[PDB]
Write a protein that holds these residues in place. Sequence first.
Motif, short mmCIF file in Angstrom:
data_model
loop_
_atom_site.label_atom_id
_atom_site.label_comp_id
_atom_site.label_asym_id
_atom_site.label_seq_id
_atom_site.Cartn_x
_atom_site.Cartn_y
_atom_site.Cartn_z
N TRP A 55 -8.17 60.80 4.99
CA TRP A 55 -8.00 59.94 6.16
C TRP A 55 -7.73 60.77 7.40
O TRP A 55 -6.87 61.66 7.40
N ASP A 97 -10.85 58.64 2.01
CA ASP A 97 -11.67 57.48 2.30
C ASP A 97 -12.63 57.20 1.14
O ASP A 97 -13.29 58.11 0.64
N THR A 116 -10.40 50.96 3.79
CA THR A 116 -9.52 51.17 4.93
C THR A 116 -8.07 51.11 4.48
O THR A 116 -7.75 50.40 3.52
N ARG A 123 -0.04 49.53 10.52
CA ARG A 123 -1.11 50.10 9.70
C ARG A 123 -0.43 50.99 8.66
O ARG A 123 -0.03 52.11 8.96
N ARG A 149 -13.53 56.75 10.74
CA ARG A 149 -14.64 55.91 10.32
C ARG A 149 -15.52 55.53 11.50
O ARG A 149 -16.75 55.46 11.36
#
Lengths: 127, 374, 71, 113
Positions: D103, D96, B101, B90, D27
């Motif tokens: 984040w 975000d 994302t 990631r 999230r």
Amino acid sequence: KWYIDRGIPYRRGYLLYGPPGCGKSSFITALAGELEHSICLLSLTDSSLSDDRLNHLLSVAPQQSLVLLEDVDAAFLSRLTFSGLLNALDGVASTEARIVFMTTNYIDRLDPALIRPGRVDLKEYVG
Amino acid sequence: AMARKGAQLGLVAFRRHYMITLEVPARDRSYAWLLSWLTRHSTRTQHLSVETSYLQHESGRISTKFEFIPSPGNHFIWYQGKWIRVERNRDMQMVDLQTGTPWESVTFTALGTDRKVFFNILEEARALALQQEEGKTVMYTAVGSEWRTFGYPRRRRPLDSVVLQQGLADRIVKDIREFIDNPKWYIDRGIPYRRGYLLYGPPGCGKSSFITALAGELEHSICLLSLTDSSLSDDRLNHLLSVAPQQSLVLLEDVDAAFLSRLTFSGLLNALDGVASTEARIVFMTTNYIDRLDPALIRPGRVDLKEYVGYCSHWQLTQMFQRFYPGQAPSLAENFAEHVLKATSEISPAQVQGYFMLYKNDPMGAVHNIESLR
Amino acid sequence: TRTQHLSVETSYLQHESGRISTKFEFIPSPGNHFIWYQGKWIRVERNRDMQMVDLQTGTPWESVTFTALGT
Amino acid sequence: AMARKGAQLGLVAFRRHYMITLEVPARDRSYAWLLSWLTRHSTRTQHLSVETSYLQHESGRISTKFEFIPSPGNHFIWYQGKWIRVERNRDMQMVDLQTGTPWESVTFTALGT
């Protein structure tokens, strides 16, 4: 699964006829809350809606939404129809878990044809 | 400097000649499929993360489903005769614009020159991802001159739930499949790729239910229309027939009323014969009787072969009894069918279905009450 | 045919009435490859730059290079 | 160079064979649930931050509710027979797009299989 295996529509109908002031609508709301299902009330005794409009609204009812109707005596005695409502109820177009409840003051004006399979299944009287 | 160059050359040669790998980005839908497949294959995944699917159904229904994914990093999986490294990186540099994302990807890293292992794993992941979904049939209505998605997707009705004859349904299904899977034969000869079918019979035979069942089995969409209504005209009918969606069988009912008389009798056949059509234009016409109609309607370029639905037969009666009641004495079903035939000859499947509803979970009572039906 | 290093991309289409149509395709993996074409050995470099993302599409900057000896 | 390689191999073997962890992104809705659960379970959370829910009900009704979340960083929780490390890392790199927040993620880190 039992209903779909035998190829029978997944619909049910119930009838509650009794003297006014018995709290039939309150009991319907209470059982809807206990079952957590949604309730959609309609007054068929009004002449605003027609037979075809009733058929559409019965068919377009949302999921897990019990549909409640009142005062069958006025419409069945006489937009206004007596066999149109049962024809719309017997229509193939339905929804998942289509449960209809019919509350009224008395059963005298009605006919045994309405209490039949594919329609109101068992009759219950509030005392 | 020489050591670094030698190491670089050795590493690049090793990767190019002896080593295999596969990469899946996070944007691709195969990412979730492969993650779920690797979660299912390896039960003892010590490092993992969780993702919940939360749905707010009407009237305040909270439906939360928990799923588990391998944690980002390095994992080792024993598959076939190989040990495969799985790297879920990631990237902590940038965020995807489309989704919102951080950039992610997954890599499968294996020793050997056998790419077929990756192909098999990917095919298995696709099959596992696809097997959860359940097929649905979407109902379509016609308003004005437009087809609309009316209602909600309908569960596909099993073919065996509806019984018509010994092989009439089988013949219809075979003919429909033969027409569907051979478009080259039609286009080579320069003939329009359209078909029509006619089902005339007594009411209560479940013709519409059988149409829906065959549409579900063929997985094709169905679009119903009531031509007996005067709301639509001949030209409106022509437009809606021509604007029908792909692989959408169009069903019409009550030809007798319109053909006896917006209202037209030759306009419908003229519209059917129109050149303007769609890919795989199949029309079905269900009606009570054929007396009011004409042989001109049953013609090439129109309804091809005529099929008549009959009343309940002994084979039909025993088949529907077996379908309703899951496992009893076949002699009891034979006696039930014989008694029904003796009592009535024009018995319809709808009446039998209602009678079985009256005696739900009551086989013996239904058997003894045949004389009551008379 | 024998591309040992590769990545996969699927074309997923949601056709009406819940039709899932997924087609699998394979692309050379980012990095260095050698191809034997004509009488030449050509280097192919698929560099996926880890610096910035394309604004129009929403993908990191990428390019491919064919590198050959001769005039 | 040999020491670094040996340490890397030992660390990766340790993580793969003896160590367990779980991650929840910001999230995901489970982030707030886990934060509230860890706040409730541990009464003596010395490091913490505050978040208020402010609602403007009709006719000028101010309804503000105060809630407390563990502060970003490292925490230790004693649960079952285990001591679990909780790492709330608020990454100071990017924001975000969907929400408009930097984040964030939370990690539960425990010894055992």
